[model samples]
Target: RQENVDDYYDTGEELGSGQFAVVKKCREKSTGLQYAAKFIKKRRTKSSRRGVSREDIEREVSILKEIQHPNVITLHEVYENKTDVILILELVAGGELFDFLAEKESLTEEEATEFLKQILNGVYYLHSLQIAHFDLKPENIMLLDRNVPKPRIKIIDFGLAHKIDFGNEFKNIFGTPEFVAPEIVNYEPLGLEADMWSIGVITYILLSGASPFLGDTKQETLANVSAVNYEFEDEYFSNTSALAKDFIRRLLVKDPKKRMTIQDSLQHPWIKPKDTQQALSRKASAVNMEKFKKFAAAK
Candidate 1:
């Protein structure tokens, strides 16, 4: 861990960036394997602490080390430097799920379910270990490779993830406003159910290309989410199935206690429909797909 990352890997082009860190494509010197090296700068400012803290870096690293799932992003190793902690992670080159779906010429319910199922399975694994992915938006869900017929989904961005400690209550307001659960807006105690709400929002968008609680402003959006305000408008969900709506309905409930769990979601008829012949073959609405493209553009 004390050795320099440069001596082991050859850094390439930048893959992505955030306020404080940058992820670059790198190749391991020995194996010539590809990876994303995230260089996170240490917090140096006294007034704002704009950069990352060592505690946060270690927390994310610890969580990543605990995860070993096909659908979740993999953390290969960690290396330290004078000003940064470099994380060598599995390279997910397929890009964001939103971009992938937006590029598709046509989409089907079956196709959408395939993606959702992968995400749920990943969450199931996390929930099993008391981990909750507070941020479960399209941006965090990624494709491993776009050329594959059925690209594998990789859930990334663990900066907001938390391992719930049952003995002590944990509560905080963090996550995209459009997908956050009511408990988050209310500042109530949070649990795995919080992630479920986000999955519900994601499912809604994936199938129909419309955001359930999105508003003109962040305040309005949070208010809508807090009130559980959304609808199956004909424009957005005309071709959506009853089972699909039911699945989203159960997850978007105002009460986290009433919300569906990852197990219940996987068991839902939409996730695993009984009528396979009609359910899987039906094409999602073209109108919705176009709307989704618009949404992606706006993003």
Candidate 2:
């Protein structure tokens, strides 16, 4: 529909802005409901090789429509005009999980596992659909309601997400180096397992507050990932449980076939302890927390 978005909603203060996109707080006049209106700059003309292409934006919209999960953001509607394509989306105001956890006075492995479960649940749903969230960094992991003691996790940012066809080969080399899988760094074909690798990195960070393959430079980081170079040093993993470490080991596998799938992860003892009471109650290392805070700030 080429109708004006302003007709149905009243836009307010800007929520966020990027190179060619701006998100604003908008209220649907009819229902008085709040939503985030993302205005994306459209390519001026089909011949021009600038701005966002129609196919690209439409692809994202279709993907948004295909995705419907508790842990994933919702798309309300869409609007198109001369310069931009406006997307009315669910407003998630709980901020990044990185900052929320960083601000915590004390954290525990149980608490971290709770968050990881939510992430796994969301990723599992996507994987079942043959969709891969190519970027699953902690920064994209968000909270739904910050006021609550245990805010629910909401995985956001689907710009790089793709639905992998069963018999088709999909290869692309685009993702944050630190969180990318070995296959990605090696320029090999990719699939749902790539997301699992990123989850492995996220799990490592959540448990130890350290990036598993981060290096000084992008090239260095890529090299580290290519070689699957990382270790559980005494300083960070000394306090982490064996089960938690094992979960990381299974996920960070070099071979996609050997890597833990979403189903395997959900059934893992770390994610589903036989007895809740027996789950490890170790406090996440304060030193690691500091490192996480530092790492997050830099990112």
Candidate 3:
């Protein structure tokens, strides 16, 4: 049975506040379930071509309703009465991966391997359903628990996600500048391979504690991202394991056709930890607190 909607739920401390929206933790009185409600103002400005309209919000609602995956944050219900559209979503207790990265200088090779494994698994699963998470970045990855044994990463923010024809090609300028893939910037036709490029950038950040392509300005950053001009410093080159570096190099390649595929990434040596027993045990817990600690200490 569907739970009754709550018009006024007590709001908690702001989880995140951006120009477009503010996310807060709230309780739904009817279901007695905690949810993360994203409040976004409806922009009616036709002059601002870049502004998201009410129609965009409605479309986002439709898309979220169709996507059902454990790894993807589920949308419970939406409340749109007046001023803003409130997206009531599954409440993930743990915060953004960006928070963890800020606390930890970088993830160790083993830790990174495990994290990447889950990410690839989730991405592959989504791709199997013909869904492409256009924005795959640290900010979009959320942990289920910060203090758990093997904290599982959940992919969130499907506002930019879409279903595409695998055989066909598309050209759309979307996604954050830092994580945008080369084909996307070049106006070339793209497919799931474009997502793989963003994943590559994410993997680089996980291992190196810095974006591979960082520039003084947004334009410069997009240019560098498109050209694949960034290079790994010796610090990263010397410290990261061979298998890990190899994996990143292949994923971060400029050519979408040459970029590592989801299946190929799963087969990468770095992803398959040598200590299989320990890896399996860690997965059972669903949270890797020890790994989080180790990563946290590095910062």
Candidate 4:
């Protein structure tokens, strides 16, 4: 183990604050590398018979170490002191996709398709490793460099991720309300397909710039989410290509068993190779003009 881990870090500004942790930017004193340090608060045990422990921090480190992919954020190192557990993670400069969408209002078909391809590719890699990113949303996808040849995407935040055997079902109620699959909300057995449902919601958000379902109260929203009480507005979506709509249809199926697999999704016409060079060229031009602008201006 490296000695004096703390000596290698020069803490900078706060990146963000979560319920149990606060992320900050830090510079490695020896290597001069930059990283984001997630400092988790040490929780106290109410029972006097027992004492506080760092199990949660240890679990997170173990999970991060297990995950390996170009599209997944990398964990550099971890250390713990008396007050907190410090996790040194890759510093993604481009920030969150949610902030990008918020600034752009929405994405065009070409741009959305490109991003969807990357997401599906990343998901397929994870599934191959028997891992499931239970939470998949704009907030969890990190952009590496906005101006790069292809805007790099790295999925982060694996607090709820887990492993499962292929063709097996699990019973668990976890994930954000808007993106949760019907089976999860209904407390029924679910599988990898549950993650696809969340991807469908994300795709809808990318295309429409608004959530497909909304209600005044949490209960109402949950009801709509479970029932899949949402529809595409032809007035706004009529311009979108048929292939793109078809892909969303397959993913949004309420029955988890019917949801599209990541491999099949990558091969879908919507994300597959273009037939005509003219059409492909036009699509690329439109994406660079519209989608890139939105991404660049995002907070």
Candidate 5:
């Protein structure tokens, strides 16, 4: 209901800047809570052939307003002016996901499992609502604290998110080069399955600390995706569990029709806690259900 930007929060230093928007640190004047305010100027913003419109901006903000999950971000409020829109977003204090994981030096099965579970739960919530976050990557994931008890993650950035209509499809050529799914590269119709492909890529990188489809150049990277020419190189994945590899293998499948979906990922042995996975595997003597996440599925 409020259109006044400065009425609620005290703005501070810039957190980051994008092509059209700039994010800043701000604290709620009324409650003293912190948030990241993304300021988008209507005039400075530019778009491509699929030119963005005012309606597109509204759609993004509306979706952000609609989603409310612990692992996915919450929009505190939105401030609108004749020329700008300031999105007050939850201020995740723990910093970026990969950066935090990188600083850890080694990733354990349990740790990865917990992170993946949290992500899966968040994504499951999103898919349950029929929303497809077309873009899922490491940078979009943020930590809440420095593991004082246990580290927690949340998914942010829904600029490319799409609301799925199962009876229809989208053929947009968007998303970051390295994370784009095979369908997107081929200009094929897309749905939530494309999001699973990204989850697969993120899972691989989270475990191995390497990009599966990244190449020397942008063109090379897309080529790798179009060809699905990625592997768990022994150098990067040798120590990663066989179940983990199997989990990723099922998701990275080129055919969207055959790739694992949200429901399939949750039942995956690898998606279960390490203790649960191991106990089940030993009890069954050869069981593996590892699969893979939401768009929080992070940066």
Candidate 6:
């Protein structure tokens, strides 16, 4: 239950700002733990989306309540007034996953594997609960700490998420241009498979510091998506493993039915290396993190 926002916490400086909501750094008076309070106005920001805004907010809130995965951000509580609602969330000091990768240039196979497994696990959990995320991208994934000993990611921004009971489908073209699935570009009915497609793109970029389907303009990008035109260019992915290449290939299929399921991805040999190699892979994550910390400190 939500007590009055002012009664329990003291709002502080802006941690970040968004179009519809502003995430302010806040402190709980009772326990003194820092948190992020995202204040969202009740009114629609875009006149065109006013009709569907309420449903989107309701669905986002509903999904946030249902999820409790480590790779997912935790919502501490929800406070509401007549005109706005404040979502008290666990404070994640680390910035966007994309920025972290862009800073590092790219991750090795093992480091990418560790992160990808966690991401796959989160998706597995969500799919088990019959929820489908219509938007999955680097921008929507956040890190707990930019320089953690081992990389840990948290999925956020569920405005386009929905409960996908069996037999139901969504036809909405709602996703970022570069990461949007082919089905979305084609206006085809979507399901959990859409998320898989975006994840494939994410995995590709994490391994190779280039976007597979990106074009000079939005029109060309959408056209590339419709054609399912993306590849492991020799120049870009010469160092990438065939195992990694195959994993992404299975998920980027034009036919959604042929795309990989979360379980299939989890079972991939590349995702589950030998027991002896697992320890070394973790050591790799630590080394990478140490480098990141030093770089961050230098900056």
**Of the candidates shown, which would achieve the greatest lDDT relative to the real structure?**
1
* Per-residue error (Å), model 4, residue 46: 5.7
The regions of model 1 sitting more than 4 angstroms off are 45-48, 275-287
Question: What is the C-alpha local distance difference test score of each model?
Answer: 0.87, 0.85, 0.74, 0.74, 0.78, 0.78
lDDT of model 1 at residue 44?
70
Per-residue lDDT of candidate 1, residues 1-299 (tens digit): 66599899999999889878899999999998999999998787656567888687888999999999999999998998778888899999999988988988867776777788999999999999999989999899999999998899999989888899979999987887888898998899999999999998988888777899999999999899998989999888877777778888999998888889899889887777667554653444233788888888888
User: Measured by TM-score, how close is model 6 to the native structure?
Assistant: 0.86
Judged by TM-score, which candidate is best? 1
Error of 2 at 264 (Å): 0.8
Which ranges of candidate 2 are over 4 A from the true structure? 46-49, 275-278, 281-287
Query: Each model's TM-score?
Result: 0.95, 0.93, 0.82, 0.84, 0.87, 0.86
Which residue ranges in model 4 land beyond 4 Å of their true spot? 1-5, 46-56, 101-107, 165-170, 277-299
How does model 1 fare in lDDT?
Answer: 0.87
Clashing pairs in 1: none
Write model 3 residue lDDT over 2-96, tens digit each, in one string: 22235557667688877678898998776677889888777757676433587767767877887777677888877775557788888888887
Candidate closer to the true structure by TM-score (higher is better), 2 or 5:
2
Model 4 C-alpha lDDT per residue in residues 100-184, reported as the tens digit of each score: 5455544556776777777888889888877778889878888876767578788888767777755666787777787788887
Regions of model 5 farther than 4 Å from truth:
44-52, 273-299
The Cα error of candidate 2 at residue 258, in Å, is 0.8
Model 4 TM-score, all chains together? 0.84
Q: What is every candidate's alpha-carbon RMSD to the true fold?
A: 1.8, 2.0, 5.2, 4.2, 5.3, 4.5
Model 4 residue 20 CA deviation (Å) reads 0.2
Residue 112, candidate 4: Cα error in Å is 2.1
